[PDB]
Design a protein around this nucleic acid. Structure first.
Ligand code: DTP
Ligand code: CA
Ligand code: CA
Ligand code: CA
Ligand code: CA
Ligand code: CA
Length: 903
DNA sequence: CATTAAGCAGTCCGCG
DNA sequence: GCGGACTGCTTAA
């Protein structure tokens, strides 16, 4: 097999590399790497090395990495560019692996771990590590085993061995319900003292050294706790055995009233699953406890136990260990679904970077571009200092706030990457400039054609049409990958709906799910077999379809994120290829494209409808247009349609057969106008929206820019079994909105869009009547808590103190002196509740860590003093008032002359 | 070592 | 009791 790296580090003049050899064996080597850098040289000097602008360079081979670094400094002092890859480990990987890396994940040791630490005096701080580590569960991906290290004797209590037999039993039978499928994979190791536990764990670690180290919150808790605990007991050099190169770096962060740290373990790639989830999941959660996320991702219930965690080991050691194990497993379950470790490996090896560098789009792209240029013997430019400078982005149309009955939307494929490719935007493809006209002059096709020779953006930039650019070349590769995966995702989505339709008529039989690949649209023969399946088999197939969709989503959305990341990197001062000419060439072109096509669509629809000057495009944001289809439906007459699906089919056909060709013609004209390299402005129909035929539903509404709701029947070619609400920007979509309020507002919208005003009024009446009965957590608002210290004046709110920070301060005073109340952590999220006048907390609100029950001591007082009136008005009524006024509806029956009668 | 546009909640201040 | 300037937070893209 071809060799591939596992980890790489620079330590002084040495590169330390862990890798898999040609026999599939894990190896380590230390290399005194001899890096090269480059300097511009005279034309008369024959060379094979050229910078990206074709200027000749001479190669400077250094005896060591420090010499190369020192030379960079001297060149800066002289005032001359020092070219080439200055991150030497990237150059080393590029030199060592001068081919496309084919890696074998089965050879890569992925470790998932979590530790338990009993602490009778508040949160056990990793930087202090003053309490015994009393449990470790460490899952090894190569062994496929959960290694459980259990401390039986501690200053905080002596306990009996954990029982695997009780652990397997149902919770309803006194057990812990450790999943049956991992019972046989547990290797249990009890210890009589902590020193022996930790010594054995370190020995184990040497035998099975993680390459990828993950788990929930490992970077901020488990890793620094284990490191510091071992340091305190055995000394720092023993602790450094956690690094296969025995080198660590301690990063101390000061927070005025916190002081925590992160430990870099050289030779290990730490990918904290919380960080992976935050980067790759495209959610924004009100809480990041493993309980909350596991519930969200897997629909599994919270791991329940009685009493505080500080007392769980002593009272119920059995459950304590079981919950440690299950916690480790739940991360594995989330990854089985989301596949973020797979993604990280794919991306890391594609770029030839340290795997943990997938968190940095700048590092990732720098490496991809360096490798691409190196293949052509080209030399990359030196990174330079740039002052931060704001620049213009996308265009967003101001919508007329209103209900909108029939809507069809259209969207440009992968806009910013497509602009890059169409225009040919790259650092080395810049051909010059032209004199800009006002943007509206381009939009309206009245400005002089910018160039008949070069490819242009309305920001004034010109690019070569007959040269390949490294940015377009490499962005195209990732786009094409993205496209493949999105295809699989959409196919799985369509397949899911086929199964959902068949679930309306399940067969009474004993059968099995069909062996199919959900990444491809089901054949007619598969569809025939599906219509004969049992509910059990259909539901299993739907689970598999949805899981395929999720896998596809992870793969496509994050490749989309990477390529969009390149467009944005051009506007980040730390990017080697920072250039606002290129960054704004993209965004300005996008503004033109959107407004150009708005014009073209208005012109076209007026033409086919026999009218003039009517506004069909009601809204647009960045690369999308929303077209009012009322006149289209009216042109034929609503009476002509047999059911909802009939008009949906009609509009689908209309968009594909009539509008899309007109849109394509419009964009081809724009491409000729800008004299672009390749036409890539592909705008396809996205949503078809409207009320159910015959209903009093309003179909859709806009309240303003980035704020709308649509009742959707078909999305990007997926014909839904049941209409789906597309709500953007409204409070239902915000993690700050109380959970039950999101729910109630969504039903309010559903009723508006599908059923009408009277249905809405009936629901509002009910929710207002029952509001006071909802669980307090379900009606609490949520906020991130930043700069708490800034507004903290002796436990009281300083000037301009934000509402949620005021709540936190109220909480801190309420829990003062109590050494077992959960402290609010800077930067993390809190639940927030308003408090009635004259409450014992002495302020208008309280806040506490999100995803948690408020501590028992003050829970009673919170519940008693909760301001339900304020809460309802602010979180529910006020947003709903916004939706209904825009939609020209009332959520409450208004008074009228009819009130004089008895109905 | 490392994208912009834009809406809403809230504080402060002004307001016989 | 609101509106304008301003900060903070969180979306859409
Ligand atoms: N998360 C983001 N970060 C940076 N730029 C973004 C982001 N989302 C969107 N943009 C910019 C770049 C996109 O090309 C443009 C249009 O957004 P959008 O339509 O969501 O995706 P897209 O056009 O890139 O892909 P798709 O093919 O899925 O439509 O807005
Ligand atoms: Ca725990
Ligand atoms: Ca798009
Ligand atoms: Ca059937
Ligand atoms: Ca879009
Ligand atoms: Ca599309």
């Amino acid at each position: 097999m071809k060799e591939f790296y596992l980890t790489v580090e620079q330590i002084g003049d040495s590169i330390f590399e862990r890798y898999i050899d040609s026999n599939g064996r894990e190896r380590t080597r230390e290399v005194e790497y001899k890096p090269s850098l480059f300097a511009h040289c005279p034309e008369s000097q024959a060379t094979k090395y050229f910078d990206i602008y074709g200027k000749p360079c001479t190669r400077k081979l250094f005896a060591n990495m420090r010499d190369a670094s020192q030379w960079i400094k001297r060149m800066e002092d002289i005032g001359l560019e020092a070219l080439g890859m200055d991150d030497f480990k990237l150059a080393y990987l590029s030199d060592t692996y001068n081919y496309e890396i084919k890696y074998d994940h089965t050879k890569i040791r992925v470790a998932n771990f979590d530790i338990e630490v009993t602490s009778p005096d508040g949160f056990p701080e990793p930087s202090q590590a003053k309490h015994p580590i009393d449990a470790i569960t460490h899952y090894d991906s190569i062994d496929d085993r959960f290694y459980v290290f259990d401390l039986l004797n501690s200053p905080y209590g002596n306990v009996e061995e954990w029982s695997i037999e009780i652990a397997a039993k149902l919770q309803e039978q006194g057990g812990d319900e450790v999943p049956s499928e991992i019972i046989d994979k547990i290797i249990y190791m009890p210890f009589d003292n902590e020193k022996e536990l930790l010594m054995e764990y370190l020995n184990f670690w040497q035998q099975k050294t993680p390459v990828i180290l993950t788990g929930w919150n490992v970077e901020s808790f488990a890793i620094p706790y284990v490191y510091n605990r071992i340091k305190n007991i055995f000394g720092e050099s023993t602790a450094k055995r956690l690094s296969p190169h025995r080198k660590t770096r301690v990063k101390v962060i000061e927070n005025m009233y916190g002081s925590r740290e992160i430990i870099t373990l050289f030779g290990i790639s730490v990918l904290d699953y919380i960080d992976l989830y935050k980067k790759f999941s495209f959610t924004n959660q009100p809480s990041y406890s493993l309980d909350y996320i596991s519930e969200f991702e897997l629909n599994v219930g919270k791991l329940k136990y009685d009493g505080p965690i500080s007392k769980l080991r002593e009272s119920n050691h059995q459950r304590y260990i079981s919950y440690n194990i299950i916690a480790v497993y739940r991360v594995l379950q989330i990854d089985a679904k989301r596949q973020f470790i797979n993604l990280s490996l794919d991306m890391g090896y594609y770029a030839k970077i340290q795997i943990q560098s997938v968190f940095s789009p700048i590092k990732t792209w720098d490496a991809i571009i360096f490798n691409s240029l190196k293949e052509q013997n080209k030399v990359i430019p030196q990174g330079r200092s740039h002052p931060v400078q704001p620049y213009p982005g996308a265009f967003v149309k101001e919508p007329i706030p209103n209900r909108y009955k029939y809507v069809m939307s259209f969207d440009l494929t992968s806009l910013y990457p497509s602009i890059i490719r169409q225009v040919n935007i790259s650092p080395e493809t810049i051909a010059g400039t032209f004199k800009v006209a006002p943007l509206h002059d381009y939009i309206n096709a009245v400005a002089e054609r910018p160039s008949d020779v070069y490819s242009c953006s309305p920001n004034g930039m010109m690019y070569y049409k007959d040269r390949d650019g490294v940015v377009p070349t490499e962005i195209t590769k990732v786009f094409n990958q993205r496209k493949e995966h999105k295809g699989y995702m959409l196919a799985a989505q369509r397949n899911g709906e086929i199964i959902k339709e068949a679930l309306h008529n399940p067969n009474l039989s004993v059968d099995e799910p069909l062996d199919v690949d959900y990444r491809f649209d089901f054949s007619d023969e598969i569809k025939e077999k599906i219509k004969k399946l049992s509910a059990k088999s259909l539901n299993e197939m739907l689970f598999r379809a949805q899981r395929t969709e999720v896998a596809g989503m992870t793969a496509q959305i994050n490749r989309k994120a990477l390529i969009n990341g390149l467009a944005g990197a051009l506007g980040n001062v730390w990017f080697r290829y920072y250039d606002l000419r290129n960054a704004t060439a993209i965004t300005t072109f996008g503004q033109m494209a959107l407004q150009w096509i708005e014009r073209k669509v208005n012109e076209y629809l007026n033409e086919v409808c026999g009218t003039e000057g009517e506004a069909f495009v009601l809204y647009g944001d960045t690369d999308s247009i929303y077209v009012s289809a009322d006149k289209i439906i009216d042109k034929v007459g609503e009476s002509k349609f047999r059911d909802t699906n009939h008009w949906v089919d009609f509009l689908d056909k209309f968009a594909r057969e009539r509008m899309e060709p007109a849109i394509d013609r419009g964009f081809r004209e724009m491409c000729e106008y800008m004299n672009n390299k390749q036409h890539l402005m592909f705008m396809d129909r996205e949503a078809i929206a409207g009320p159910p035929l015959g209903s009093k539903g309003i179909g859709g509404f806009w309240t303003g820019k980035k704020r709308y709701a649509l009742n959707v029947w078909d999305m990007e070619g997926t014909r839904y079994a049941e209409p789906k609400l597309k709500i953007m920007g409204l409070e239902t979509q915000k993690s700050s909105t109380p959970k039950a309020v999101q729910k109630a507002l969504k039903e309010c919208i559903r009723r508006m869009l599908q059923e009408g005003e009277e249905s809405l009024q009936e629901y509002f009446k009910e929710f207002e009547k029952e509001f006071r009965q909802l669980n307090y957590i379900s009606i609490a608002s949520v906020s991130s808590a930043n700069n708490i210290a800034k507004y903290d004046v002796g436990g009281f709110p300083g000037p301009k103190c934000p509402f949620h920070i005021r709540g936190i301060l109220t909480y801190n005073r309420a829990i003062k002196g109590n050494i077992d109340a959960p402290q609010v952590v800077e930067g993390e999220k809190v639940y927030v509740l308003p408090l009635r006048e004259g409450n014992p907390f002495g302020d208008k609100c309280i806040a506490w860590p999100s995803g948690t029950e408020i501590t028992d001591l003050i829970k009673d007082d919170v519940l008693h003093w909760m301001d339900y009136t304020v809460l309802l008005e602010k979180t529910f009524i006020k947003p709903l008032e916004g939706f209904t006024s825009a939609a020209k509806l009332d959520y409450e029956k208004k008074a009228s002359l009819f009130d004089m009668f008895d109905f």
